Design a protein around this nucleic acid. Sequence first.
RNA 1: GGUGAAAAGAACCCCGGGAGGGGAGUGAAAUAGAGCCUGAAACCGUGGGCUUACAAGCAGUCACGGCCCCGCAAGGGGUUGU
RNA 2: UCGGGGCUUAAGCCCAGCGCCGAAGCUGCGGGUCUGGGGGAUGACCCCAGGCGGUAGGGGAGCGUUCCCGAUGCCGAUGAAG
Lengths: 137, 52, 112, 101, 116
Amino acid sequence: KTYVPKQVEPRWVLIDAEGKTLGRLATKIATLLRGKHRPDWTPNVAMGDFVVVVNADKIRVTGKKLEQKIYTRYSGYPGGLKKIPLEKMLATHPERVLEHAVKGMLPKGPLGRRLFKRLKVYAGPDHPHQAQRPEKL
Amino acid sequence: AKHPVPKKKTSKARRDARRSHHALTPPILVPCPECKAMKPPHTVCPECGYYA
Amino acid sequence: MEAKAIARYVRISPRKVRLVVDLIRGKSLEEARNILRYTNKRGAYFVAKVLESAAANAVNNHDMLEDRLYVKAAYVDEGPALKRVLPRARGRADIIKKRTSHITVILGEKHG
Amino acid sequence: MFAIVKTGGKQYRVEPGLKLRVEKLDAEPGATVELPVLLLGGEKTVVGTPVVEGASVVAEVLGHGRGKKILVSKFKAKVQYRRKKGHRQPYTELLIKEIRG
Amino acid sequence: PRAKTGVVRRRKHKKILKLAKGYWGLRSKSRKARETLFAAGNYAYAHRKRRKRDFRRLWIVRINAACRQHGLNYSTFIHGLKKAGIEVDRKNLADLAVREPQVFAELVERAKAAQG
RNA sequence: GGUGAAAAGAACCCCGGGAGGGGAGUGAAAUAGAGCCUGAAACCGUGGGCUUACAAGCAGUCACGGCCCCGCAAGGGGUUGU
RNA sequence: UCGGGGCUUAAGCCCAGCGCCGAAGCUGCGGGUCUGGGGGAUGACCCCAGGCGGUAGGGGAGCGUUCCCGAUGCCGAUGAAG
Ligand SMILES: [Mg+2]
Ligand SMILES: [Mg+2]
Ligand SMILES: [Mg+2]
Ligand SMILES: [Mg+2]
Ligand SMILES: [Mg+2]
Ligand SMILES: [Mg+2]
């Protein structure tokens, strides 16, 4: 029978974001978000590495995107289709742009939402100085 | 019989759930100055009497 | 040790008395007595009467002491039902179901 | 000594003597049988060719026997078609003994 | 001669109702169970074929994530072995990445040289 | 339509207005106690094991894990988290 | 809204190349069954190979309930049927 893993300590990670393409970066963040990188993978338990990102505003994006890219927030009320361009998100809470990126690449299941928690994001940098901080590119 | 009609026989589980708040609540009583009997607050009582 | 006391064929709805019963389940004897006393319900009377008898049976037949017993358990059961007719508009004849109860009350010795 | 060995079309590592269960085989009840098929070992027995050359994993056939009766059953909607059928797989109780490479 | 339906049916039913025991609502208390069983029946058979596929990929992620740690693609890894002529590492027992990683490592080294 | 071999159909005490019970007693048998042999199923209910209040569904099935229970062991049963 | 996140010397389009994924198709190991063929005083059974989705529909082989012969028998209070 295939290996039956057990409790594993959360491996935190420190991730840059300057000049990093939105999609290309989110990809690695998600794959590392779940323990999919470690050969001891197990979709059942879900034990992905705690990813913490900084320098959110620094994220690059190709061609017409700051102006073209649109987001959609729909309330249950009529006409509540409220939509926002990319430039505005960077103005308000910019961390959002990357979150809605990773969130979109995370699985639809409940545990996936549990993974989205493992994902921390800001722009300064300066994370909540906890302990772990294994830098990466 | 007319327009209002139940579409489906409600599941036994769903039925019991409705009667969630249905549960009663025990009355409130207190020892009286007379006998040790338990009178309801702000009240007299038989086999005990009262004053004033 | 435990003492039972059943009241079969009581003209009253189960769901109705179940409420009263659920109040005293696992309660001290004297404590329960007072509950039934001032509880605003019809089912109270039938549960109080039988529960009262459960104490008598516990004493005069099982050497249990009045000052130390409680309601180990209790529950009502649905007996048969008295089906009746009912004249309805346009001649519809709907049967009515005056159900009956089977209140059971079992006392028991406390501790030591 | 993790010794691999393919028999019955399926392969699995092998501990230094331990109770294992493999596909049926034409062997005596409690006799002995040698599996020339062998892959790797304890000290990195790199398998040059598909299967290692001079090497063999032996194990005493502890006995034969059938097992859990898994239940198969076909069905198809809007068409009277349903097939109840039982099936239980036979297997040999290969007790690992020698593991000489 | 008359032949009462007798016990025949009751035995046929409870026989089935036992098999369906554990389910939900009337679905485990009546002929509804029968319907449910047909679904479960065709589910077990379909999920029996799935069970292979499930682990097929289950190991592949283990394998790929493993040799990707040493520095190479899963396709790169396998190609080397298929070339080196080593059917040894059946994808299942490729789990060595957890058990005796050194062994798995040398298997990678073989794949490295076997390619070129 | 059916108590039981036989009425031996429960004297007497206790709670109670009664009904109905708890003792005692008869009987091989009283969940054979009186529309009473056998008593299945729907349906109602109490106690116990496991489970659930960030969750999306023809209700199951496939895998892993936890908890409870049987076994010298491996193993088997119940529950369901993902 | 391209299935969605996303994607710009591409995660788009055209040209060429090597490698891998991926079905219940195929191979591997095991068991069924039917058919044809071989061993065979030996009926028997062993071995080889191939077919085996399936409604109307045809064919074939069984299980089970009621009753009769079997019964002036056998099982049965050390417990039949249910
Ligand atoms: Mg009227
Ligand atoms: Mg009605
Ligand atoms: Mg269908
Ligand atoms: Mg009887
Ligand atoms: Mg289990
Ligand atoms: Mg025929």
